[PDB]
Amino acid sequence: ATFEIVNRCSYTVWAAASKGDAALDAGGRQLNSGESWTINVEPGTNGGKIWARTDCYFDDSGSGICKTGDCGGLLRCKRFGRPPTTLAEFSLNQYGKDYIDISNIKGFNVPMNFSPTTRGCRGVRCAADIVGQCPAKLKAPGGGCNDACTVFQTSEYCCTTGKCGPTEYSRFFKRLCPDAFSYVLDKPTTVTCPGSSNYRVTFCPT
């Protein structure tokens, strides 16, 4: 499948693409305002994620640091990124279907639209001002709005027993972005698309 990743933000972001134990395509790249990056993702890929990173510094060897979404100090991510990170999530070619979603389970840094560029399903978006409205205890100094699991490390926020309910904090994310996951056992906002669809991820869509 092909993904086109577009930065519509007025600031630079460093895009990242990983399946947790490996890069997808090159794994990461700088995107100035308006730039597009096209990647290829192997059919059958289960548990892929795309995210933006903010305020990065890299040397010539591709080693450095980002304020949100850092993946072990690398430009080309092999692993998932440090919260807070708005996440585009996908599993492809699973018994003839693709499954996509946006998640706030690991917090929010940048607004996002995740849409098919082929026919047969709809897209999803979280584009509200979550950082501006973020509750004081969840604000990250580096930028962004952390989830409650990352901050407080309780069984209820992290859903460690497989039983948990919504919380004051999960309800904040859900109020601003109904079409994204707000906690592990949220009613699913997953979209089912035809197998082998192609997609576009747009940062700062509005």
Side-chain angles (χ1 to χ4, degrees), residues 28-147:
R29 217 202 87 175
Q30 182 173 325
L31 294 178
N32 295 319
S33 179
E35 291 190 325
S36 308
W37 179 34
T38 294
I39 66 169
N40 283 282
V41 174
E42 273 200 51
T45 292
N46 184 256
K49 306 194 199 287
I50 290 166
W51 69 102
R53 301 169 288 175
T54 61
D55 294 303
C56 305
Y57 295 85
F58 295 108
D59 68 21
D60 282 323
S61 78
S63 272
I65 191 162
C66 304
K67 291 200 184 179
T68 68
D70 189 86
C71 59
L74 301 182
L75 175 62
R76 297 183 201 66
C77 291
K78 288 189 267 209
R79 306 298 172 160
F80 295 139
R82 185 170 189 284
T85 54
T86 321
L87 296 168
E89 303 188 305
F90 51 89
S91 293
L92 313 177
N93 306 103
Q94 305 292 306
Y95 303 100
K97 299 293 188 178
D98 292 357
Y99 297 96
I100 68 167
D101 70 83
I102 291 174
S103 175
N104 293 141
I105 291 165
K106 296 285 178 186
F108 176 102
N109 61 339
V110 171
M112 167 186 289
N113 182 100
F114 186 9
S115 290
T117 59
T118 48
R119 167 90 202 159
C121 51
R122 66 180 201 104
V124 281
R125 174 175 304 195
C126 178
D129 186 14
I130 291 179
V131 180
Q133 294 302 355
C134 186
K137 292 189 174 174
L138 299 183
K139 284 183 181 298
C145 188
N146 285 126
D147 67 284

